[PDB]
Every structure is written in C-alpha cells, then in structure tokens.
Amino acid sequence: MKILTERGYSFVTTAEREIVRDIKEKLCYVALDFENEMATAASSSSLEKSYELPDGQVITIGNERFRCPETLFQPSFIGMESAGIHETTYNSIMKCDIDIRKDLYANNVLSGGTTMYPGIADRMQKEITALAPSTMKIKIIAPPERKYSVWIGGSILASLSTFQQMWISKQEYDEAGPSIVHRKC
Amino acid sequence: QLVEEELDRAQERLATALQKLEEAEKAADESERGMKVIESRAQKDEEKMEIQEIQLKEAK
Ligand SMILES: Nc1ncnc2c1ncn2[C@@H]1O[C@H](COP(=O)(O)OP(=O)(O)O)[C@@H](O)[C@H]1O
C-alpha cells in the first residue's frame, strides 16, 4: 500500500487494504536475484502486468511485484532490524546440536499463506545454500497445499486414538481453573 | 385523403422500423454472446500463458 503511491495509486481505506491484499496474492513473486531483476525491470517493460480494480480503472505495476515480498529477505525495507527468513532459519539451525543439523538442513518444511509466492522455495534454497557448508544437501519442502498444512495436521492429530487422553476435560478445568492449560497440557 | 394515407403508410413504415429494431437487438444479443465467449477464452489463454512463462522462468 505504501509502495504503490509512487505510481499514483492511493489506497487508504480498510476496504482498499483488502483490494491491495488481492493485488498481492495475484501479481507478486520472489525474485531469485534481486539486483539484476531490478536492473531488468528498469531496462525493459516485460515485467509489467495489469490489474483491474472493482470499478474499472486498470492499474499497472512493475518492480513492485517483487519488491513487495522481497521484504521477507530484507526486513530493513520496513525499518525492522531483524534478518531475513533465510538467515533466521539458518540461525535456528545453528542453534541446535551439531548431530541433528545435517538432518535439519534437508527438511526445511514451508507452511502458511505467506510462503505461497512463486519462486520463494528457489530463493530460500539459494540463500541457505550460500550460508550452509558446501557439503550439506539443502532441501526446501514446499507442498502445493501448504496454506492449509496446520489444519490438515490438526485433523490428523485430533483423529489419533492415542490422543484421546490428551484433551482437557471440563472436570479438569472445574478443578484447576483456567491455568490448567499451560500447566499440564 | 392525405390524412389517412400518411396515417397508414407511416404506420406500416413504423411496423417496419420496429421490426428493424428487433433485428438490431437480436444482432446485439448474438454479438454480445460472441464477445463474452471470446473474452472468457482470452482470459483462460492469458492466465495459462502466464503460468507457463513463469514456469520457464523458474526452470531455467
Ligand atoms: N497465493 C498467495 N500469494 C501470496 N500471498 C498470499 C497468497 N495467499 C495468501 N497470501 C497471504 O497469506 C495471508 C494469509 O495466510 P494464512 O496462512 O491464512 O495466515 P493465517 O494462518 O494467519 O490466517 C494473507 O495476508 C495473504 O497476504
């Protein structure tokens, strides 16, 4: 919403925020190499696509398409101090015991909606490969339905027979108070 | 006789005009049908083209 104002389009309402969310879900992708992608978009106009708001009024966006999700890898674009998702993944790995991180390097599982951009698995693998030692096999696992992985796994879990003793019954709550939840389960 | 001759001649010509209008609106209907099917086809083709071009992008 903030980066689209430099082309003239101004979305300020909450409804317009929903419109911009739809634009993001339809036109944005992750660039494998950000710098030369930027130079390419500057040179030609083959990256420009068009979107039609729900009153006519087509809008055309250029390098915004990949500048929007690039923030995941350079969170300094929005004034945050953290590191990109590739770097926090690598740090979380390197915070684990040296014997399991070879098997962690090869089972990076992606989940949730924000991991649905075209080309995010390739960029992620490139970055982690550049960070990790040159002997490990980096494998990014990105299922085609990863937007509902949490719900699917939750149904699998709640269906297990060995899980039917892990519920928090009403009686346990009546005994222990709301603090039952984290104190035991 | 001028009154009644203008009357019935203009009336039958008005009938011909309304039939021409019905023909014109049916032409509008068929043209609109062609337009809608063709634009839907164009939409499908364009979205598939975009999928395939980005697939070549990732592949290469
Ligand atoms: N195809 C897509 N491409 C890019 N982003 C998407 C896509 N689909 C959803 N999103 C983003 O994912 C978010 C919703 O994802 P979701 O996993 O449902 O989050 P939550 O689990 O918190 O509800 C939205 O903010 C939207 O911007």
From Swiss-Prot, chain A:
Keywords, sorted A to Z: Acetylation, ATP-binding, Cytoplasm, Cytoskeleton, Hydrolase, Methylation, Muscle protein, Nucleotide-binding, Oxidation
One GO-annotated biological process of the protein: response to xenobiotic stimulus
Ranges annotated as spanning the membrane: none
UniProt subcellular location: Cytoplasm, Cytoskeleton
GO cellular component, one term: synapse
A GO MF label: microfilament motor activity
UniProt modification remark: MICAL1 and MICAL2 produce the (R)-S-oxide form. The (R)-S-oxide form is reverted by MSRB1 and MSRB2, which promotes actin repolymerization.
First-listed, main subcellular location of the protein, grouped into a coarse class: cytoplasm
Function of the protein: Actins are highly conserved proteins that are involved in various types of cell motility and are ubiquitously expressed in all eukaryotic cells.
Protein name listed in UniProt: Actin, alpha cardiac muscle 1
From Swiss-Prot, chain B:
Inducing factors: Induced in stimulated quiescent cells.
Domain of life: Eukaryota
Ranges where the record places region Disordered: 24-44
Location within or outside the cell: Cytoplasm, Cytoskeleton
Written domain comment of the UniProt record: The molecule is in a coiled coil structure that is formed by 2 polypeptide chains. The sequence exhibits a prominent seven-residues periodicity.
Sequence similarity: Belongs to the tropomyosin family.
Its job: Binds to actin filaments in muscle and non-muscle cells. Plays a central role, in association with the troponin complex, in the calcium dependent regulation of vertebrate striated muscle contraction. Smooth muscle contraction is regulated by interaction with caldesmon. In non-muscle cells is implicated in stabilizing cytoskeleton actin filaments.
Miscellaneous comment: The sequences of cardiac and skeletal muscles are identical.
Assembly mode: Homodimer. Heterodimer of an alpha (TPM1, TPM3 or TPM4) and a beta (TPM2) chain. Interacts with HRG (via the HRR domain); the interaction contributes to the antiangiogenic properties of the histidine/proline-rich region (HRR) of HRG. Interacts (via N-terminus) with LMOD2 (via N-terminus) and TMOD1 (via N-terminus).
Protein name, UniProt field: Tropomyosin alpha-1 chain
Taxonomic lineage from the root: Eukaryota, Metazoa, Chordata, Craniata, Vertebrata
Record gene name: Tpm1
